[PDB]
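Q: For a teaching session next week I want to show students how multiple molecules come together into a single three-dimensional assembly. I've collected the sequence lines for a complex. Could you give me the predicted C-alpha cells for the whole thing so I can convert them for display?
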Amino acid sequence: SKLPLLTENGGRVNRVGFTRLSREGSIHKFGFFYEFTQESLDFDSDDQLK
Amino acid sequence: SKLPLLTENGGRVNRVGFTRLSREGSIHKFGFFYEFTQESLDFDSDDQLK
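A: Of course. Below is the structure for the complete assembly, covering every listed component.
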C-alpha cells in the first residue's frame, strides 16, 4: 500500500521528509566532608587514625 | 506395454511428439524525492546536511 510507485508521466508523487532529534547530558557537582578536633587525633589510642 | 520395439523388417512403428511451454515476467517503475531550500543548507546548524 505504501510502496512508492511511479507512473509514466511522473510528477509530484512520492515526496519524502526527514527529521533530526537531539540529545542532552549535564554535569553535576558532588561532595562531602568530615570534621575532627585536634584533641581527637591526639589523646587517642590509635596513632594511625587519620 | 509401451517400450519401443523394432522388427528387422522395416519401421514406421514408433513416432513421438514434443511440447514446449513459455514463462513470462514484467517490469515496474519506482521513485521518490524530497524538496529543500538554499537557506536550509547554508543557515542550518549542521554543515553536512546535504
